Amino acid sequence: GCVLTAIHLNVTDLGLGYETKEELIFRYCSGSCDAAETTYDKILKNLSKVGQACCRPIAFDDDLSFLDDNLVYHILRKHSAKRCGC
Amino acid sequence: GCVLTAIHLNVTDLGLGYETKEELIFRYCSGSCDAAETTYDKILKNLSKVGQACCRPIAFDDDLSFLDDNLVYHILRKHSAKRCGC
Amino acid sequence: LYFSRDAYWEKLYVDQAAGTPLLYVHALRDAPEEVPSFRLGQHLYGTYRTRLHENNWICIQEDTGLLYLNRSLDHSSWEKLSVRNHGFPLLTVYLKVFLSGECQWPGCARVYFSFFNTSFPACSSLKPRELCFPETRPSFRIRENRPPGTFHQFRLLPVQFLCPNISVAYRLLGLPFRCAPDSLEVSTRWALDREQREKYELVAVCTVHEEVVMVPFPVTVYDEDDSAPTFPAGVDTASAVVEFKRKEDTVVATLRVFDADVVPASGELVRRYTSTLLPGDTWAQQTFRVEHWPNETSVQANGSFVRATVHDYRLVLNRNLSISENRTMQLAVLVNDSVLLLHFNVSVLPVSLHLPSTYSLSVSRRARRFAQIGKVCVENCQAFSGINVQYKLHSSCSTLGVVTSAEDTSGILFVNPKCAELHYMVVATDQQTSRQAQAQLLVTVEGCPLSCAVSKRRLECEECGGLGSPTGRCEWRQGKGITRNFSTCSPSTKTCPDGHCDVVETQDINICPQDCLRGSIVGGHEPGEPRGIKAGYGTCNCFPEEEKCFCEP
Amino acid sequence: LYFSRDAYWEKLYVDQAAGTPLLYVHALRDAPEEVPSFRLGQHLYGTYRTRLHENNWICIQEDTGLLYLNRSLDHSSWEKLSVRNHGFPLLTVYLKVFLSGECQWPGCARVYFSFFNTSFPACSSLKPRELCFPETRPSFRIRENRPPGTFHQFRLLPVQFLCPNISVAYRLLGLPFRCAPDSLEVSTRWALDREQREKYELVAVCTVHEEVVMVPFPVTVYDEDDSAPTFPAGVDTASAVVEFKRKEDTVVATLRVFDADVVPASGELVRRYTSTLLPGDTWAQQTFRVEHWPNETSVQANGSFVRATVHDYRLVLNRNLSISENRTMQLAVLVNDSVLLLHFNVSVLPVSLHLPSTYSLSVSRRARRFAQIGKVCVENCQAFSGINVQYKLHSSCSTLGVVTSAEDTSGILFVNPKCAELHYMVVATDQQTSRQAQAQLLVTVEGCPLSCAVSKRRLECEECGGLGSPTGRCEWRQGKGITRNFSTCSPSTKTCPDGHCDVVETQDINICPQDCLRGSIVGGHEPGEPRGIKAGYGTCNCFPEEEKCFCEP
Amino acid sequence: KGNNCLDAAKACNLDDICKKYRSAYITPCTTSVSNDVCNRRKCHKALRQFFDKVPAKHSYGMLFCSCRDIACTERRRQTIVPVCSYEEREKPNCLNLQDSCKTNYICRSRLADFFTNCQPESRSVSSCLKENYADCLLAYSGLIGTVMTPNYIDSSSLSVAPWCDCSNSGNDLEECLKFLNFFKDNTCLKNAIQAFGNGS
Amino acid sequence: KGNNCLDAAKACNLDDICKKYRSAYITPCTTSVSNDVCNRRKCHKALRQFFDKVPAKHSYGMLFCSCRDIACTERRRQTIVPVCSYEEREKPNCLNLQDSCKTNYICRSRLADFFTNCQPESRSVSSCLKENYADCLLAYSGLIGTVMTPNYIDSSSLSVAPWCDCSNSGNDLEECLKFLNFFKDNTCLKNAIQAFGNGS
Ligand SMILES: [Ca+2]
Ligand SMILES: [Ca+2]
Ligand SMILES: [Ca+2]
Ligand SMILES: [Ca+2]
Ligand SMILES: [Ca+2]
Ligand SMILES: [Ca+2]
Ligand SMILES: [Ca+2]
Ligand SMILES: [Ca+2]
């Protein structure tokens, strides 16, 4: 279902506008769930383009930070995950 | 966003196959969210027909149960909601 | 001395005279010596048995049991009482009549009075419907086999006492009931018995002046222990041979006894109908018992459906017998009724433990753990009930394994390097007797999720195997709404999607969950009565590590 | 008596003779009476100052300060020591030279020796580059204004002691430095002063046999307190009038003093350059102080860039002065240097509290609470610094309200039934002096989320109003990457999306959050240095009840 | 058109308190356990807490919905599930059911109430007092959930009965019927049912 | 092609422990507070815990990435943020910086280590012992994060310096330069930098 997957990326590939080239190792949660799992969702499917369950994290990791070109450090809190859930 | 809405229905309109006509008051969660709300979802939108956030509940209510025609009671657990979230 | 009825009805009005007769009473006789004495009560009991005031207005004749006013009735008396009436509308007070606390038959009979706001109405305002009998009908109650006598008198005493100029006549319709002319006492000629007839709803004929009136007349006839136990037309004793079951309890032999009474009712039936076991060997007290429960039935005897009891006696086992018992006895039973003789030929035969020795079977080597292959069965398969025949597998390469299922005491064998023929000397033991046997197996060998229930589609079940497979793969069963024919990718197509949860399926909680999970299925379901599915909607697939299944199309 | 240098270098070899001279030493004179005595140390100190063994091989002449071997050097001695060398390669040991602990100039001078595995090399294996001077160059250190003398001697003593058949000559290049013929002592004729020249990097000329060699020769000249404080060409005393600020501290007047020395360095500058405040009224000690910090500069005096100190003296306020002070004094300062006279004309003038009395303004009646409309200003707007001029609003209908902002001490007025003209007698008070004033306001009146920052688009901000609106609606400001020009639906287009968080914006936490929230913005951001935004990517909208904003395109 | 019973069900289940304690009396009555069909004890406990806590106009509607066709009378009898809660394998004798109620506290409370309340005496107007109807009502519907459970038999009328008969009675038979038809043919209780089913 | 510094950054940030305590020395150095530009004290504390906990081959790579073009030498100087952590408004005198290090425990540890380690004595082979390089390394990079912070000045060479000069010195000037150029022109430390930047 909602499972863990590590990846390599650039902070330029985060694309927040920070002027650097430095990188990171990023761990995300992917894969859909069972799409009903209670009576209430069955009745939501009966009543209705907004809909069923999602994949999210259940906690967050420690920080990720770096230097840009222009003389300045940049910080990131709440950016990548450890454990995944519906 | 994902908000609360009460409704009147029949248990026949639940359509689980129970042989009755008795009813209920059902409270659901409707309305989509802000569709990005993190860098990770921006990069998911960059990479990709499966997609962005949903509307779900955050808890469940107390039980809902009844009688059918044929001499038999029927129970329901986990069927309707109190509070709604992305 | 008992009362022919229980409750008496008569009406009062304002300013009636003293000495104005109300009613006669009647008391029957169980013996000719029985002289009915009569006396009154004291307090006018009101609605919801409220004592109201000392009755000083009324006297009685013991000799006839005649009620008559000594004092007269007036609005000072009837508003003195209607305040005590607790704010309720007044139309009923009553008294007690003892003849030799709470008033009941046969010691007592309560007599009512229904007062009205008006006084005594005139003779022309009285319709002939209410000149013959009062409205609330009597209920006559006679015991059988008594000194026969008189139980009823006709005349409305205020009516003829204050309107005597109307000629009023009363009579009755091979019946012992007769009405005398010139004296309106109702009598019975000879004594009744229930065992011939038991219901007499006759008609009393009234004649006014002109109108003739017909009224009901119910008589209930009682019963006695004038009967001893009796066989049902030449059936004295049955017998059978204790053969196969040997459970802790099983009904063996059954006899019927006809006592023609009803009278020892279902409460004091413990005290009289005792199944006295006549002794013998004390081993029968270890191993047998006599159960006795009645049921009462009706029969035509002289045109009425007279009822009585049927007393059945049963021999039920008392313990789980061993195999090797070979004995015989004759067990006698005395029967009380307040005394018949019964017996039973009871013989115990032992059972041979001869398992079929030579039998062979082929096993696909691709099979997974807990794989159902073959049935080991003793010579009497569907017949043992209280014997623990346990299967031991001595071997002479570990692939197979047997545990006896406690249902059939039969063996469903399971899976617990160039070795494609083996030798399993199957040893068939017992626990309560050390007697075992053994037999020869000549087993011939012929060369994705964890469980099967996680599967969802047809080819998803057929192209992939689970944990308990004797074939390597699982098997899809496929069959209205909330019904026992549901569908699942089940392992054991005669044992998994089945309705029984055996010891093949319950060792580790992955094998066959539809019949053996303890979760909570979401869906249009109906819970399996041990556990699991009794019914489920659409498709039903399971995720057992979360201990949960789902029914959803 | 001080040493012309600090560290001395000479080489040793195996089996050199006793009485073999190593080096002369030199010690300068601060007085002509100063007789340099010389004695040696005791332990051969090794690498990382490790005592190795008692030096018994070497004696000295105090009179010339000549080092020479009393005993000879052999492999029994140099493997006795190289084990004590802690497993490190041996090329450097040293001693101490006291002249009248840790060895330092001018009490001591440490002398090195660089031993080699070979013995003394022959005369033809010595290139004329290493016959003149050793490799590690000397560093000559002379104090100015001394009895001038001799500080250096040329001859390599093992070279001529064991290869005397090579004619070797040494000389030097209006300089007091001279080299005598037939005696190779280097002398200085007259005494030096730093204040004329301070750097002498000359060249000593060596002649072998044929090769002539040129070498460096650095001399550092020191300094004294031969100088008293001095004015910078006719600048004695400044003055100013204490006018507007009246902060706790502000520099008022500034003077420059030139003492031509360097010698009282930055450590003991507290002990000598004391700003002695000459007394007067004690009110100046309540209200003023004299700060003194140096900075050292260089100047051309006779072709070199001779450096000295610059001593500035400043008058800085000591407390928040009141308004009504009207006085004058002449504050004198004595200056020490180990003594100059300074003063300051200091006059305090009071400030009038004449607010402009008659002023009118129009207010749209649709405006919301905390609505910025107009500026109240005292007669000297951008000029007060340490005076708490607080605004009180006496009225004679509650729509408007004023609180003084503590930045400008100016009034930004806010919103806290057929009444469309009012009268607000604006009362301008102070806290430290009871002096107030008052003035006349003739205010003329002319007939969706909670905050503005929750808005997201252009017309979404322009077609809907928030909490702090003077116009009823909000206002969209719209302006690269992580930059201070960001965009928001801000209330106060000169005060909300601004960079300052005033008391207009901070009463209840809904008004202008971009400059005043305390949250944590997600996005390419750069935090506002008090709080809030300094920069944010794309579009930035806020949700203040969760105390959070977002920057996202 | 439906009937009065489904509309009374709409009346109960729309209030969430009636619905929640409805599920309270539902749950142990229909989870079948090993070698039973339900638990009788928990089910009856939960019916008693339903007919004590939740107020009148929801429950007495569904219990006393006036009927005009036959499936109404079915559901009229259905009101407490005979199959788990009222029926058993056997009917005992009615005095046995009376003393087994007499070994129960709350049962004897409801039975003394019913002796008190729906009594058909001499000639008042509708065989009752017409304002002790509710006490009549809180008698019968009071009797629900203890061991003496009344329920309908005659779908075509309003004659209720418990789970016994006057078999095996002997001498007390008529007294049995004096008890038994007291549930079966009461003019006062039938007037109360008709009055509550007309809309009183 | 990049340079050695971005690849050494790839070397550090791929290990998550180097990255986590990287963010530890990042965070208080660049959240600007009211009337400062950062906190110097928390920032230097966090640099010290970074250069104590995380092992060698990540950090000394980025700090000692050998340079061939000018933005490399920029980032070479950039290694500890002068603007918040090394630069201030003023340079004091170097003996003042020495005694202010002498009022600091860990600083004096690193300074006595650097006195011990990268010493350019008489003629060994590469002005060092070549296997006390790491002790040379754990001297200089040891000195990071206390009040005596060395950093680069000459981008075109390897001459490092702290935040002082020999102004206001008077008599101790040359001794000052004896100290000062000890950071600036060390043959042993420059041989160690070249050796670590060739891949030792
Ligand atoms: Ca008889
Ligand atoms: Ca008899
Ligand atoms: Ca008998
Ligand atoms: Ca099964
Ligand atoms: Ca001088
Ligand atoms: Ca001087
Ligand atoms: Ca001086
Ligand atoms: Ca602002």
Numbering used by the authors:
A (entry chain B), B (entry chain A): 117 to 164, 173 to 210
C (entry chain E), D (entry chain F): 29 to 128, 135 to 207, 211 to 246, 251 to 379, 388 to 445, 449 to 468, 476 to 506, 515 to 546, ...
E (entry chain C), F (entry chain D): 150 to 349
Sentences from the paper on this structure:
Signaling through RET plays essential regulatory roles in the development of the nervous system and kidney. Glia cell line-derived growth factor (GDNF), Neurturin (NRTN), Artemin (ARTN) and Persephin are four ligands that induce dimerization of RET through assembling 2:2:2 ternary complexes with RET and the co-receptors GDNF receptor-α family proteins (GFRα1–4). Here, we report the cryo-EM structures of four extracellular 2:2:2 ligand/co-receptor/RET complexes, including GDF15/GFRAL/RET, GDNF/GFRα1/RET, NRTN/GFRα2/RET and ARTN/GFRα3/RET, at near-atomic resolution. The structures show that the extracellular region of RET adopts a ‘C-clamp’ shape, which is stabilized by extensive inter-domain interactions as well as binding of calcium ion at multiple sites.
The reconstruction of the GDNF/GFRα1/RET complex reached lower resolution (4.4 Å) due to preferred orientation of particles. The structure of the intact RET extracellular region in complex with GDNF and GFRα1 has been determined at low resolution by negative-stain electron microscopy (EM), showing an overall batwing-like shape in which the two wing-shaped RET molecules are tethered together by the dimeric GDNF/GFRα1 complex in the middle, and suggesting that the CRD is important for the dimerization and activation of RET. All four complexes show the same batwing-like architecture as shown in the previously reported negative-stain EM structure of the GDNF/GRFα1/RET, with the dimeric ligands located at the center connecting the two wings formed together by RET and the co-receptors. The segments in GFRα1, GFRα2 and GFRα3 corresponding to the helix-loop-helix-loop motif in GFRAL are much shorter and adopt extended loop conformations. As a result, interfaces I in GFRα1/RET, GFRα2/RET and GFRα3/RET are much smaller (buried surface areas less than 700 Å2) and likely weaker than that in GFRAL/RET (buried surface area ~ 1500 Å2). Interfaces II of GFRα1, GFRα2 and GFRα3 with RET (buried surface areas ~ 730–1010 Å2) however are more extensive than that in GFRAL/RET (buried surface areas ~ 680 Å2), which may partially compensate for their weaker interfaces I. The D1 domain of the co-receptors is invisible in the 3D reconstructions of GDF15/GFRAL/RET, GDNF/GFRα1/RET, and ARTN/GFRα3/RET, suggesting that it is not involved in the binding to either RET or the ligands in these three complexes. However, there are large differences in the angle between the two wings of the batwing-shaped complexes, which mainly originate from the different conformations of the ligand dimers and their different interfaces with the co-receptors. This angle in the GDF15/GFRAL/RET complex (~60°) is much more acute than that in the complexes of GDNF/GFRα1/RET (130°), NRTN/GFRα2/RET (105°) and ARTN/GFRα3/RET (108°).
